[PDB]
Amino acid sequence: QERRWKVAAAKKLVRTVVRHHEEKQLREERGKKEEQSRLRRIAASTAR
């Protein structure tokens, strides 16, 4: 039982770490696109 638990806990922690890094990277990419859209919004307001 301890062996089964340790294997599963290791898998759980590693998949959580992988998702954490995936989320951080996608958040950075979304931030870059958001900044682009923000500058476009300011330009649109000035144009209006």
């Binding site: 900044e35 500058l39 476009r40 300011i42 330009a43 649109a44 307001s45 000035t46 144009a47």
Partner: protein, 370 residues
């Protein structure tokens, strides 16, 4: 009133927001004495700027701090700004916001240096940076289109959508009024008129600005010039000698449409504009074709609008509506657009304050200016 300063490769235009024309226009040049030793002893200034340097061109070495639209000498640029504020506008920069123009694709480091100089050296209360082509579009009452800006040192085509320039479709052409002046000098030497001095170079520039024009049909114009002398015009030199100029009047500006005349493998301004439009999204190309605005001093040639219209109509699909917009005062379109932008009540909240600069540093310019 906020100050608007147009940083042009050949001429600098500065004035007060809300005016219809710049108050001061002078060459963006800094002159230094050729022989320091003899002339420093007699109390002479270490450097001359603008018109003073141009009037003493026979004894001064002239250098341009902006090359092809990019600032290459920050000390000379700072000296030009000091000269503008204290000699041309005669105002204290610490009491008036200043709006500065920038060339397309301006490096972020250059924007940061400009912001640092404006806040630390001139203690300006607020500043804003605007793209020259974007201001040119604003001066024409349009917000979606492509601006073909050809100044003294570089030509850029900039497609703009609802006020936002599309960087991926901006094209740069290192061909402008200076190269055309040198080409006119070369072809006049080929005809037998020798211009070798800087004064003679400025005479050739004046000849270019007063007598050159863009032919609608280059082949037909060449045949007319070869068959008749009706296109020849006379120019009186400062010494009284009258020179006759023939096919050079339209062969010189033809280099803008056919850079091969100078040995350049780059596409002409019409082909560059077409390629820039083709890099944009299909849905906005229709708006770009109908809103092509010409800007810059090199676009002042009579007939350039008709030639551009013809070339774009020949290059664009027959189903697209082509309209070329050439404002009469297009040489001041950048400054006029800046004056309009700085005169809006809502724009007063877009100024970068000294407090914001002290809190965020020079990087605030990238999050406030587009």
């Amino acid at each position: 009133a906020a100050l608007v300063v147009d940083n042009g490769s050949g001429m600098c235009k500065a004035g007060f927001a809300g005016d219809d024309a710049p108050r001061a226009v002078f060459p963006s040049i800094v002159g230094r004495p050729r022989h320091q030793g003899v002339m420093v002893g007699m109390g002479q200034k270490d450097s001359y700027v603008g018109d003073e340097a141009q009037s003493k061109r026979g004894i001064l070495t002239l250098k341009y701090p902006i090359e092809h639209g990019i600032v290459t000498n920050w000390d000379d640029m700072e000296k030009i700004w000091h000269h503008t504020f204290y000699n041309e506008l005669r105002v204290a920069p610490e009491e008036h916001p200043v709006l500065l123009t920038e060339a397309p694709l301006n490096p972020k480091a250059n924007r940061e240096k400009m912001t640092q100089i404006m806040f630390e050296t001139f203690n300006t209360p607020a500043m804003y940076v605007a793209i020259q082509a974007v201001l040119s579009l604003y001066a024409s009452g349009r917000t979606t289109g492509i601006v073909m800006d050809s100044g003294d040192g570089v030509t850029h085509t900039v497609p703009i959508y609802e006020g936002y320039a599309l960087p991926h479709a901006i094209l740069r052409l290192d061909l402008a009024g200076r190269d055309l002046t040198d080409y006119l000098m070369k072809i006049l030497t080929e005809r037998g008129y020798s211009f070798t001095t800087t004064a003679e170079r400025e005479i050739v520039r004046d000849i270019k600005e007063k007598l050159c024009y863009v032919a609608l049909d280059f082949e037909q114009e060449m045949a007319t010039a070869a068959s008749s002398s009706s296109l020849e015009k006379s120019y009186e030199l400062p010494d009284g000698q009258v020179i006759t100029i023939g096919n050079e009047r339209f062969r010189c500006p033809e280099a803008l449409f056919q850079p091969s005349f100078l040995g350049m493998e780059s596409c002409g301004i019409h082909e560059t504009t077409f390629n820039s439009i083709m890099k944009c999204d299909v849905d906005i190309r229709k708006d770009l074709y109908a809103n092509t605005v010409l800007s810059g001093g090199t676009t002042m040639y009579p007939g350039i609008a008709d030639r551009m219209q013809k070339e774009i109509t020949a290059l664009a699909p027959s189903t697209m509506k082509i309209k070329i917009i050439a404002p009469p005062e297009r040489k001041y379109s950048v400054w006029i657009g800046g004056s309009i932008l700085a005169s809006l009540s809502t724009f007063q909240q877009m100024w970068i304050s000294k407090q914001e600069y002290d809190e965020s540093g020079p990087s605030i310019v990238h999050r406030k200016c587009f």
